[PDB]
Symmetry: C3
Subunit: 155 residues, 3 copies
């Protein structure tokens, strides 16, 4: 068994919606990023790659490479997962923590779990997503962006 941890942040910019955990969530502002800016899946990806000792998302899918512009972070998740499985690992379970003042993530979590469980080829019970605000404190509390943390356990 191997443990992994990921952390990611994206700033708000433009018109909504935002894509979090693969779900299109309505919001006043959108998120700025090379890909679709899915903070949750990026953090999740780093956790899995980390547990596999494969590095991180930027190393495998460079900000510079134009092939990843507007990229579906789920596509990146699946590829990172493919490579991980090739190194010989299987999923243990993953846990994600979205840190945002708004929008409300709770109603979208079930669908996020559905998408992630599909992408990782596992049972929905092997996937957990949660959210918390920083009580108006910080860049997240001031609504400047969304952060996300994740841990993974590979077998």
């Amino acid at each position: 068994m191997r443990i992994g941890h990921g952390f990611d942040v994206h700033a708000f910019g433009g018109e909504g919606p935002i894509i979090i955990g693969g779900v299109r969530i309505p919001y006043e502002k959108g998120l700025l990023a090379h890909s679709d800016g899915d903070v949750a899946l990026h953090a999740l990806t780093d956790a899995l790659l980390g547990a596999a000792a494969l590095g991180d998302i930027g190393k495998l899918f460079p900000d510079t490479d134009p092939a990843f512009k507007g990229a579906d972070s789920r596509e990146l998740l699946r590829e990172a997962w493919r490579r991980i499985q090739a190194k010989g690992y299987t999923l243990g379970n993953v846990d994600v923590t979205i840190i945002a003042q708004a929008p409300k993530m709770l109603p979208h979590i079930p669908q996020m779990r559905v998408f992630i469980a599909e992408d990782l080829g596992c049972h929905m019970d092997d996937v957990n997503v949660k959210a918390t605000t920083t009580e108006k404190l910080g860049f997240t509390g001031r609504g400047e962006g969304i952060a996300c943390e994740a841990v993974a356990l590979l077998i």
Copy 2:
């Protein structure tokens, strides 16, 4: 074995003391929250619920429900633990990291461990709590609030 991760933040407000890890710690200011605002136990709770794929603290004990006003976060911890055990899990070990410029947490950690070990029904050796400041940087460094992170391993 399942892994879990939690993160929580509460802003200072009012007169002290603050309750962290169940311990009443003397401080100039107190913490604002629906319950007693125990940042450490909330983060710990999310870690355990996450590892159990039970969601998060807000989902089980809503900010809206007046039954949780002034609530003892230890009561919430035990209940979340009860439910977790019902899903069939046993405690592996937990690790907590309190992020605060002040007050000093170190002298209160032993008692925190005592409380948590009791609430989780485990040996004190299965529980670890630590602290760090962000070196005056950030909302924590500016003394605007306390943050806390936690990881858990269920069996």
Copy 3:
């Protein structure tokens, strides 16, 4: 198997270079701290100590004790590791996440892995280090300091 988590922050100050994961990295500014201020190894140390239920870095190597001034964080890592092994644990794997806007950590990661794997007496495959920026948001985004998170799995 036991899980651990660590988090650390150090503010920029003075002339460079900075020491991260044991590597001397060229930078305009340096990092302020009692020891060499290696944010990555401190976070890693707390993760390992946490998983071992040995507390944290400050508890074992006090900011007050002048013996640790300018200290090589690798020396502190090895000692914490020595004690951990004495409690009976062996390394599972560790994962580190450096949170910095700059400098670029990627090219220095291989050497960091070499140092850490040596200090922990393991294969480089049992060690992973990654980096991410907070997209100009926060004290890290504003270049005020570097943060770092880490998780560890002991056996």
